[PDB]
Amino acid sequence: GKIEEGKLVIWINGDKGYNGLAEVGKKFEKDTGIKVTVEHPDKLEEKFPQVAATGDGPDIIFWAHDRFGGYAQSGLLAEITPDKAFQDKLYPFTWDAVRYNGKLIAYPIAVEALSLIYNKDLLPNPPKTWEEIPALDKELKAKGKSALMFNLQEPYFTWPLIAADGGYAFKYENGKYDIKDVGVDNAGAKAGLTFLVDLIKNKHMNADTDYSIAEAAFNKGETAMTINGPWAWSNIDTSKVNYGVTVLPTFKGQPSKPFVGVLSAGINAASPNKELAKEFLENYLLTDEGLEAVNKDKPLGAVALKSYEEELAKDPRIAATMENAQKGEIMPNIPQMSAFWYAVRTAVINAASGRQTVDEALKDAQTGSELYRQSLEIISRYLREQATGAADTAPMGASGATSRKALETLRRVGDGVQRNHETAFQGMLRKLDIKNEDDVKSLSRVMIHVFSDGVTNWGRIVTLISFGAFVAKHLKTINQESCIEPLAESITDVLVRTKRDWLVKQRGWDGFVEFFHV
Numbered sequence: 002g003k004i005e006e007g008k009l010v011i012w013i014n015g016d017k018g019y020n021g022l023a024e025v026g027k028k029f030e031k032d033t034g035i036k037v038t039v040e041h042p043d044k045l046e047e048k049f050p051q052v053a054a055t056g057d058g059p060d061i062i063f064w065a066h067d068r069f070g071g072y073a074q075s076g077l078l079a080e081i082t083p084d085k086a087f088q089d090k091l092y093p094f095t096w097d098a099v100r101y102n103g104k105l106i107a108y109p110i111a112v113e114a115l116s117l118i119y120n121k122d123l124l125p126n127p128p129k130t131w132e133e134i135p136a137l138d139k140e141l142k143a144k145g146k147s148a149l150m151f152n153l154q155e156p157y158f159t160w161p162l163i164a165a166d167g168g169y170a171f172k173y174e175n176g177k178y179d180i181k182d183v184g185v186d187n188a189g190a191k192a193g194l195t196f197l198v199d200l201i202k203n204k205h206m207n208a209d210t211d212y213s214i215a216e217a218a219f220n221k222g223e224t225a226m227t228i229n230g231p232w233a234w235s236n237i238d239t240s241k242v243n244y245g246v247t248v249l250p251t252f253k254g255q256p257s258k259p260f261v262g263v264l265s266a267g268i269n270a271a272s273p274n275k276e277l278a279k280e281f282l283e284n285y286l287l288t289d290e291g292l293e294a295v296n297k298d299k300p301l302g303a304v305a306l307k308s309y310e311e312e313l314a315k316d317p318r319i320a321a322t323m324e325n326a327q328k329g330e331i332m333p334n335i336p337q338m339s340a341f342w343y344a345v346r347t348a349v350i351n352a353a354s355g356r357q358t359v360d361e362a363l364k365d366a367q368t369g370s371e372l373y374r375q376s377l378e379i380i381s382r383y384l385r386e387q388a389t390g391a392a393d394t395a396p397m398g399a400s401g402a403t404s405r406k407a408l409e410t411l412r413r414v415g416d417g418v419q420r421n422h423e424t425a426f427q428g429m430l431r432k433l434d435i436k437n438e439d440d441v442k443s444l445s446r447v448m449i450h451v452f453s454d455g456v457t458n459w460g461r462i463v464t465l466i467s468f469g470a471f472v473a474k475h476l477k478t479i480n481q482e483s484c485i486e487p488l489a490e491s492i493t494d495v496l497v498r499t500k501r502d503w504l505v506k507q508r509g510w511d512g513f514v515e516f517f518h519v
């Protein structure tokens with residue numbers, strides 16, 4: 002449960018150039034005597050937050066930048082403080098992708114976007130539109146081939162099509178996100194996912210196709226096209242398929258919009274090797290020779306280092322990567338990105354398999370993506386109005402009827418719980434000795450341990466939130482009102498992390514209102 006001093010452990014995904022990264026590690030070891038271990042665990046982006054929360058895990062984690070905001074919000078990443086001379090060596094927009102709440106929380110490595118990859122011997126002119134792919138598949142099936150195979154198990158690969166006609170994750174306008182404006186179940190998202198499901202229904206695609214199946218079929222020449230990123234080009238090179246990399250097809254006349262990732266390297270906040278890690282990343286990896294070693298193993302895409310990016314910029318495959326990137330959007334790094342991806346992953350799999358209709362699947366994904374912010378709105382408002390005696394006048398915003406009605410239900414049932422359970426609430430408020438902001442941050446572990454043991458139902462959720470209001474009242478009297486919002490965030494985090502699937506099954510806070518109706 003403690004990271005070892007005097008070595009570096011690095012985690013990177015198994016589709017990236019980890020043997021090349023290990024070569025950089027060997028060069029580090031030659032200068033310093035410090036051994037560098039590169040590992041590629043399964044589901045490392047899910048494992049890192051669990052093990053790092055205990056003070057364990059790798060010294061350095063590599064992932065696309067979208068997951069790092071969550072890690073940073075949880076206190077799991079060291080702040081990065083490169084000097085100006087180093088910062089100036091990387092493109093400013095890559096640093097922007099690894100900024101969270103004003104601080105740099107990772108080193109950017111390379112810019113990744115999906116492209117259409119096609120077999121020039123089968124398909125001299127790849128299709129410009131998604132709509133022409135069914136007819137192309139029919140032509141190719143008559144030749145013992147198929148038009149298109151790509152990974153249908155990870156929503157990253159289907160998102161460019163879902164977004165094309167108007168789907169979006171979190172709305173971006175006037176230089177900032179509106180986290181409460183989620184675009185997963187609108188008409189444009191439905192149109193794109195319906196087109197995907199229709200491709201499967203019409204036998205142009207198979208719902209069970211995953212990364213390995215699609216890669217094998219393309220690299221053996223059975224399918225004329227795939228959708229993948231730069232890391233995949235190495236294995237196609239080895240297959241000697243005559244391939245090209247080009248712009249994704251349009252849908253309803255609009256570009257496919259891939260979510261653009263910046264592969265990034267974060268330092269574990271619990272690492273006793275932060276100076277070594279910074280030395281490795283700045284003076285070994287993020288150099289022309291270090292990125293070359295990784296890129297020669299599995300291509301990185303458009304690297305963040307200006308000097309080496311210019312050296313590779315003439316590669317037509319990189320130009321296509323950046324053309325598709327310009328038509329897409331840089332992913333947010335907000336902490337709810339993990340929940341968004343989990344919700345949309347399930348929606349695509351369920352729609353593709355027929356377990357849910359497109360309408361059902363996207364509705365559930367919308368609820369899952371909105372769950373944190375909607376829960377916080379309700380919980381923060383209830384705690385604050387209970388503590389101060391006066392309600393928040395600010396508009397509820399999106400799903401404001403749901404929030405207003407849930408808050409109204411909570412006012413009824415939560416005030417009764419606080420009345421009837423004053424005895425236990427007073428007793429618990431003594432055992433916990435909450436005096437300051439530091440005491441509040443300590444509550445999450447006891448909260449999780451009590452709340453995640455036993456039956457799940459709305460009554461216990463009312464008890465969780467009602468005791469929160471009881472504590473908010475206390476915080477107000479000891480002149481610690483500024484601790485109420487952090488407390489509300491902590492309660493919300495416990496609720497939505499421990500009860501995500503159950504909450505979505507109940508239709509979220511709409512199920513709460515109907516459970517307690519009349």
Ligand SMILES: CCc1c2c(nn1C)[C@@H](CCN1CCOCC1)OCCCCn1c(C(=O)O)c(CCCOc3cccc4cc(F)ccc34)c3ccc(Cl)c-2c31
Pocket residue numbers: 422424425426427428429432433444447448451452461464465466468469470472488492
């Ligand atoms: C129902 C009220 C109640 C409870 C207790 N007894 N009784 C009668 C305490 C024993 C009480 N003894 C202990 C010895 O000093 C005399 C009283 O143990 C039983 C645990 C089950 C009942 N249960 C539940 C529940 O998950 O069901 C909760 C919500 C989950 C845990 O939330 C929190 C825990 C800790 C800090 C929190 C701070 C917050 F800001 C918000 C939630 C917090 C819950 C929350 C508070 C209480 Cl008091 C009870 C709860």
Ligand SMILES: OC[C@H]1O[C@H](O[C@H]2[C@H](O)[C@@H](O)[C@@H](O)O[C@@H]2CO)[C@H](O)[C@@H](O)[C@@H]1O
Pocket residue numbers: 014016046065066067068113155156157158230262342
């Ligand atoms: O599928 C959801 C998934 O999308 C992205 O992960 C990409 C990753 O950025 C690429 O580097 C490559 O490894 O493929 C992954 C998809 O399998 C998000 O970065 C990730 O957080 C998200 O879960």
Ligand SMILES: [Mg+2]
Pocket residue numbers: 015041042043
């Ligand atoms: Mg592995």
